[PDB]
Amino acid sequence: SVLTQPPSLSASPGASARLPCTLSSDLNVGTKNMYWYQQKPGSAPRLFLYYYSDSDKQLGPGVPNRVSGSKETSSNTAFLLISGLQPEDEADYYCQVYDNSARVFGGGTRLTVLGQPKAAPSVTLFPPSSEELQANKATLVCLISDFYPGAVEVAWKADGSAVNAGVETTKPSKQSNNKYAASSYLSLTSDQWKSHKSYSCQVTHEGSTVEKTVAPA
Protein backbone atom coordinates (compact mmCIF):
# COMPACT_ATOMS: atom_id res chain seq x y z
CA SER A 1 0.00 0.00 0.00
CA VAL A 2 1.52 3.27 -1.24
CA LEU A 3 -0.09 6.70 -1.39
CA THR A 4 1.71 9.00 -3.83
CA GLN A 5 1.63 12.80 -3.60
CA PRO A 6 3.66 15.40 -5.50
CA PRO A 7 6.39 16.87 -3.28
CA SER A 8 5.29 20.46 -3.88
CA LEU A 9 2.63 22.46 -5.70
CA SER A 10 2.13 26.18 -6.16
CA ALA A 11 -0.67 28.54 -7.14
CA SER A 12 -2.08 32.02 -6.61
CA PRO A 13 -5.13 33.04 -4.54
CA GLY A 14 -8.55 32.93 -6.17
CA ALA A 15 -7.45 29.72 -7.88
CA SER A 16 -9.21 26.38 -7.67
CA ALA A 17 -6.30 24.44 -6.20
CA ARG A 18 -6.07 20.71 -6.92
CA LEU A 19 -3.88 18.45 -4.78
CA PRO A 20 -3.79 14.83 -5.98
CA CYS A 21 -3.25 11.62 -4.04
CA THR A 22 -2.73 8.51 -6.16
CA LEU A 23 -3.55 5.20 -4.50
CA SER A 24 -1.51 2.13 -5.37
CA SER A 25 -3.31 -0.73 -7.12
CA ASP A 26 -3.44 -2.35 -3.66
CA LEU A 27 -6.53 -0.22 -2.99
CA ASN A 28 -9.43 1.22 -4.97
CA VAL A 29 -10.07 4.94 -4.45
CA GLY A 30 -13.84 4.62 -4.88
CA THR A 31 -14.11 2.31 -1.86
CA LYS A 32 -11.84 4.26 0.51
CA ASN A 33 -12.30 6.88 3.18
CA MET A 34 -10.07 9.89 2.50
CA TYR A 35 -8.61 11.91 5.38
CA TRP A 36 -6.66 15.08 4.59
CA TYR A 37 -4.50 16.72 7.26
CA GLN A 38 -3.20 20.29 7.14
CA GLN A 39 0.10 21.23 8.79
CA LYS A 40 1.49 24.76 8.76
CA PRO A 41 5.09 25.51 9.83
CA GLY A 42 5.41 25.55 13.60
CA SER A 43 2.09 23.77 14.20
CA ALA A 44 0.73 20.26 14.59
CA PRO A 45 -1.34 18.54 11.88
CA ARG A 46 -5.06 19.28 11.86
CA LEU A 47 -7.82 17.13 10.41
CA PHE A 48 -8.71 19.09 7.27
CA LEU A 49 -11.24 17.02 5.31
CA TYR A 50 -12.96 13.64 5.48
CA TYR A 51 -14.19 12.52 2.06
CA TYR A 52 -15.86 9.37 0.78
CA SER A 53 -18.23 10.97 -1.75
CA ASP A 54 -20.04 14.24 -2.41
CA SER A 55 -22.82 12.82 -0.21
CA ASP A 56 -20.46 11.51 2.51
CA LYS A 57 -17.95 14.10 3.72
CA GLN A 58 -17.20 16.45 6.59
CA LEU A 59 -14.99 19.52 6.84
CA GLY A 60 -12.61 19.98 9.75
CA PRO A 61 -13.37 22.41 12.56
CA GLY A 62 -12.82 25.92 11.27
CA VAL A 63 -12.22 24.79 7.67
CA PRO A 64 -14.07 27.07 5.21
CA ASN A 65 -16.64 25.99 2.64
CA ARG A 66 -14.11 26.52 -0.16
CA VAL A 67 -12.55 23.15 0.72
CA SER A 68 -13.91 20.13 -1.14
CA GLY A 69 -12.85 16.68 -2.28
CA SER A 70 -13.33 14.29 -5.18
CA LYS A 71 -12.14 11.01 -6.70
CA GLU A 72 -11.33 9.60 -10.13
CA THR A 73 -11.41 5.82 -10.48
CA SER A 74 -9.55 5.55 -13.80
CA SER A 75 -6.34 6.89 -12.22
CA ASN A 76 -7.19 5.59 -8.71
CA THR A 77 -6.60 9.14 -7.48
CA ALA A 78 -8.18 11.26 -4.75
CA PHE A 79 -8.16 15.06 -4.86
CA LEU A 80 -8.23 17.90 -2.37
CA LEU A 81 -9.86 21.03 -3.80
CA ILE A 82 -9.61 24.63 -2.58
CA SER A 83 -11.94 27.17 -4.16
CA GLY A 84 -10.77 30.78 -4.09
CA LEU A 85 -7.29 30.26 -2.65
CA GLN A 86 -5.81 32.66 -0.09
CA PRO A 87 -2.44 33.06 1.67
CA GLU A 88 -3.80 31.40 4.82
CA ASP A 89 -4.22 28.17 2.83
CA GLU A 90 -0.43 27.88 2.37
CA ALA A 91 0.60 24.74 4.27
CA ASP A 92 1.56 21.10 3.83
CA TYR A 93 -1.23 18.64 3.08
CA TYR A 94 -1.19 14.88 3.63
CA CYS A 95 -3.71 12.32 2.46
CA GLN A 96 -4.32 9.27 4.63
CA VAL A 97 -6.09 6.00 4.47
CA TYR A 98 -7.09 3.10 6.66
CA ASP A 99 -6.32 -0.50 5.68
CA ASN A 100 -6.61 -3.36 8.19
CA SER A 101 -4.98 -1.68 11.21
CA ALA A 102 -2.61 0.34 8.98
CA ARG A 103 -2.95 4.12 8.77
CA VAL A 104 -1.07 4.98 5.57
CA PHE A 105 0.02 8.57 4.95
CA GLY A 106 0.99 9.99 1.59
CA GLY A 107 4.30 11.71 1.04
CA GLY A 108 2.67 15.09 1.59
CA THR A 109 2.16 18.03 -0.76
CA ARG A 110 3.74 21.36 0.20
CA LEU A 111 1.29 23.90 -1.21
CA THR A 112 2.71 27.37 -1.84
CA VAL A 113 0.19 30.17 -2.11
CA LEU A 114 2.18 32.20 -4.63
CA GLY A 115 3.48 35.42 -3.16
CA GLN A 116 6.44 36.11 -5.38
CA PRO A 117 7.41 36.14 -9.04
CA LYS A 118 8.92 32.68 -9.24
CA ALA A 119 12.57 33.39 -8.51
CA ALA A 120 15.57 31.97 -10.31
CA PRO A 121 17.84 29.87 -8.04
CA SER A 122 21.44 31.05 -7.64
CA VAL A 123 23.89 28.15 -7.36
CA THR A 124 27.58 27.90 -6.50
CA LEU A 125 29.68 24.73 -6.24
CA PHE A 126 32.95 24.53 -4.30
CA PRO A 127 35.70 21.92 -4.65
CA PRO A 128 37.65 20.41 -1.75
CA SER A 129 40.24 22.80 -0.37
CA SER A 130 43.84 21.69 0.15
CA GLU A 131 44.04 21.41 3.95
CA GLU A 132 41.30 18.77 4.12
CA LEU A 133 42.72 16.66 1.27
CA GLN A 134 45.95 16.32 3.25
CA ALA A 135 43.65 14.97 5.98
CA ASN A 136 42.72 12.26 3.40
CA LYS A 137 39.13 13.50 2.85
CA ALA A 138 37.39 15.55 0.17
CA THR A 139 33.94 17.10 0.58
CA LEU A 140 32.19 19.09 -2.15
CA VAL A 141 29.63 21.69 -1.04
CA CYS A 142 26.77 22.90 -3.25
CA LEU A 143 24.86 25.94 -1.99
CA ILE A 144 21.44 27.16 -3.25
CA SER A 145 20.02 30.56 -2.29
CA ASP A 146 17.25 32.97 -3.31
CA PHE A 147 14.77 30.64 -4.99
CA TYR A 148 10.98 30.26 -5.43
CA PRO A 149 8.79 27.79 -3.46
CA GLY A 150 11.07 25.90 -1.16
CA ALA A 151 11.32 22.72 -3.20
CA VAL A 152 14.43 21.79 -5.19
CA GLU A 153 15.85 18.43 -6.24
CA VAL A 154 19.62 17.95 -6.32
CA ALA A 155 21.35 15.18 -8.27
CA TRP A 156 25.09 14.53 -7.98
CA LYS A 157 27.10 13.47 -10.97
CA ALA A 158 30.59 12.18 -11.65
CA ASP A 159 32.02 11.46 -15.13
CA GLY A 160 28.49 11.03 -16.52
CA SER A 161 27.28 8.41 -14.02
CA ALA A 162 24.88 9.54 -11.31
CA VAL A 163 26.24 8.95 -7.81
CA ASN A 164 24.01 8.11 -4.85
CA ALA A 165 26.51 7.84 -1.99
CA GLY A 166 27.84 10.32 0.55
CA VAL A 167 25.04 12.79 -0.22
CA GLU A 168 23.21 14.89 2.37
CA THR A 169 21.06 17.89 1.43
CA THR A 170 19.41 20.38 3.76
CA LYS A 171 15.69 21.00 3.67
CA PRO A 172 14.66 24.35 2.16
CA SER A 173 14.70 27.24 4.60
CA LYS A 174 13.13 30.69 4.55
CA GLN A 175 15.70 33.46 4.93
CA SER A 176 15.82 37.26 5.07
CA ASN A 177 13.97 38.28 1.89
CA ASN A 178 11.29 35.62 2.33
CA LYS A 179 13.06 33.45 -0.20
CA TYR A 180 14.41 29.95 0.33
CA ALA A 181 17.89 28.50 0.73
CA ALA A 182 19.41 25.02 0.89
CA SER A 183 22.74 23.21 0.62
CA SER A 184 23.83 19.78 -0.61
CA TYR A 185 27.02 18.02 0.51
CA LEU A 186 28.98 15.30 -1.29
CA SER A 187 31.43 13.42 0.94
CA LEU A 188 34.26 11.47 -0.71
CA THR A 189 37.84 10.45 0.01
CA SER A 190 40.97 11.94 -1.55
CA ASP A 191 41.39 9.04 -3.97
CA GLN A 192 37.66 9.03 -4.75
CA TRP A 193 37.93 12.75 -5.53
CA LYS A 194 40.90 12.30 -7.89
CA SER A 195 39.40 9.20 -9.55
CA HIS A 196 36.84 11.21 -11.54
CA LYS A 197 37.72 13.90 -14.07
CA SER A 198 34.65 16.03 -13.34
CA TYR A 199 31.82 16.34 -10.82
CA SER A 200 28.60 18.32 -11.09
CA CYS A 201 25.84 19.63 -8.88
CA GLN A 202 22.52 19.28 -10.72
CA VAL A 203 19.64 21.19 -9.09
CA THR A 204 16.19 21.14 -10.69
CA HIS A 205 13.36 23.48 -9.72
CA GLU A 206 9.97 23.47 -11.46
CA GLY A 207 11.19 21.25 -14.26
CA SER A 208 14.12 23.51 -15.21
CA THR A 209 17.59 22.35 -14.20
CA VAL A 210 20.63 24.43 -13.24
CA GLU A 211 23.92 22.55 -13.28
CA LYS A 212 27.38 23.62 -12.08
CA THR A 213 30.57 21.59 -12.46
CA VAL A 214 33.93 21.51 -10.70
CA ALA A 215 37.18 19.82 -11.71
CA PRO A 216 40.24 18.68 -9.72
CA ALA A 217 42.43 20.41 -12.33
Partner 1 sequence: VQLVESGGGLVQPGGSLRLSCAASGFTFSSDGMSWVRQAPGKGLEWVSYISSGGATTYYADSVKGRFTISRDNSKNTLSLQMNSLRGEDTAVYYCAKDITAPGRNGLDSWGQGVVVTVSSASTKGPSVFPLAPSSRSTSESTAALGCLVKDYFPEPVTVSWNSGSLTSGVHTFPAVLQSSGLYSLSSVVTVPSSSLGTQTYVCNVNHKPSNTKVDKRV
Name the residues that contact partner 1, by CB under 8 A.
33, 35, 37, 44-47, 50, 58, 94, 96, 98, 101-108, 124, 126-129, 131-132, 135, 139, 141, 143, 145, 168-171, 173, 175, 181-183, 185, 187
Could you tell me the CA-to-CA distances from 80 to 19, 61, 94, 116, 161 in Å, in that order?
5, 16, 10, 24, 39
CB closer to partner 1 out of 168 and 191: 168
How far is residue 165's CA from residue 156's CA, in Å, rounded to a whole number?
Answer: 9
Instruction: Provide the minimum distance between the beta carbon of 90 and partner 1 in the complex, in angstroms, as a whole number.
Output: 18
Q: Closest distance between partner 1 and the C-beta of residue 131, in Å? A: 6
Estimate to the nearest angstrom the gap between the alpha carbon of 63 and the chain centroid.
Answer: 24
Q: Other C-beta atoms within 10 Å of 9: how many?
A: 17
Question: Can you list the pairs that 66-72 forms with residues at least 24 positions away whose Cβ atoms lie under 8 Å?
Answer: 69/34, 69/36, 71/29, 71/30, 71/34, 72/29
CB of 98 to partner 1, least distance (A): 6
Torsion of CA 30, 63, 21, 95, to 10 degrees: -90
Instruction: Give 106 or 121: the residue with its C-beta nearer to partner 1.
Output: 106
Q: Which is nearer to partner 1, 13 or 46 (CB)?
A: 46
User: From the CB of 121, what's the least distance to partner 1, in Å?
Assistant: 14
Q: Give least dist CB 190 to partner 1, A.
A: 13
Is residue 25 helix, strand or coil? coil
Measured from the CB atom, the residue of 1 and 209 that comes closer to partner 1 is: 1
> In terms of CB distance, is 128 or 149 closer to partner 1?
128
**CA 217 – CA 198 distance, rounded (Å):** 9
**89: DSSP letter:** G
Nearer residue to partner 1 within complex by CB, 28 or 170: 170
| Least separation in angstroms between CB 173 and partner 1 | 5
